[PDB]
Design a protein around this ligand. Structure first.
Ligand SMILES: O=C(O)CCC(=O)C(=O)O
Ligand SMILES: O=C(O)CCC(=O)C(=O)O
Ligand SMILES: [Hg+2]
Ligand SMILES: [Hg+2]
Lengths: 213, 212
């Protein structure tokens, strides 16, 4: 919105490309900077001794993140794993620059607070979907969020502009891949979605959304 | 920490809320921002059926009513904020915040830290909710409460909260019946004790590693 305008100051800041799959920060990296994602989808996650990961966030275009750095800076380290879930473009300021920025250009402070406020709300939406007791509805709820966060109008309805694997979904809705496959199958044979080259299209979100609630 | 100092400007009076009394309802305009000073506030989502699902258990010193920073009165509340314990808080109308932040920048940073902190806490909740078996969903949840509302006691750490089986079920996305069974198991296994609705976990550092 205007976060873009804000972040593009603070130097002329250069964009950063991240190829799909490439990690933006690792657990253990010092929380020394703040990020505005400009294009693409970033996936925050928690990584276990086993090597398995659990998805804590799918950040969407225009999301501020790396927020821990506003608490701590170097003081403490990252404990989540930020990864380019699609090809990604972002800005990235070292935190101390932010302070000095906000001090002098207050206008940004408000915009910043709105950014974070918006994130609190989106996380809570995720809690809500995760709170569903049956997986069928956990899934549909999750898809509906993606429909709004990454949706693109298409002839058959709304298409989730994301390469979603069954495993990525499983790690998002706290499920096994096998169960995601079965559920996605059921949705398809019920003429509610279609998947083409890993992109899901939901035909009638407003319907699906009311069909469950 | 210092949010307290910040909010106490704007001389603002505290507000008491009796346990169970609602702080805002779905449909109330997002007219103001809140700092909870003492007690526990429960944000939830309310369904046609009347049933509710817990989205947050806010903890002493949490900023909340955050939607008002996006929209002000222009859009309405869609969550239900309720005093889960007796509560004391401050409550500024948003436009007063803007003017505050404009003039006392120092607060802006402090504010951003408050919201940052909230993003992280919510993500912790996502994590517990992500556990595939309820046993571990429960334990993970209890461990959060141990840190958010824990008080040292002789037998270990006591969660300073009146937690019913139904409140728990609404927090970890479970049926009441299952919460009763799970809590039973935890007790018969000498891992927690519950008195007069307060849960005490004997060895959090152990329980926390016992599962991970
Ligand atoms: O939610 C986020 O912004 C990512 C978590 C985080 O801020 C961090 O690890 O520093
Ligand atoms: O996360 C919060 O602060 C409560 C959600 C909120 O601000 C609202 O529903 O207006
Ligand atoms: Hg949508
Ligand atoms: Hg603890």
């Amino acid at each position: 919105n205007s976060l873009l305008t804000m972040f593009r100051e603070l130097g002329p800041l250069q964009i950063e490309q991240f190829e799909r799959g490439k990690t933006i920060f690792f657990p253990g990296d010092p929380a020394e900077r703040v990020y505005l994602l400009v294009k693409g989808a970033v996936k925050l996650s928690r990584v276990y001794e086993s090597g398995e990961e659990i998805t804590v966030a799918l950040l969407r275009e225009n999301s501020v993140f790396g927020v821990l750095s506003l608490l701590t800076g170097q003081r403490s380290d990252r404990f989540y794993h930020a990864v380019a879930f699609t090809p990604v473009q972002l800005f990235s300021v070292p935190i101390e620059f932010m302070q000095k920025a906000l001090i002098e250009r207050p206008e940004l402070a408000n915009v910043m607070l709105q950014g974070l406020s918006s994130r609190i709300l989106q996380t809570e939406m995720m809690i809500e979907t995760l709170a569903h007791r049956d997986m069928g509805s956990r899934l549909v709820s999750f898809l509906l969020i993606l429909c709004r966060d990454f949706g693109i109008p298409s002839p058959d309805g709304i298409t989730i502009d994301l390469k979603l694997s069954h495993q990525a979904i499983a790690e998002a809705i706290g499920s096994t891949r096998v169960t995601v496959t079965r559920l996605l199958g059921d949705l398809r044979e019920s003429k509610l979605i279609a998947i083409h080259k890993k992109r899901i299209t939901v035909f009638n979100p407003v319907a699906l959304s009311q069909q469950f609630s």
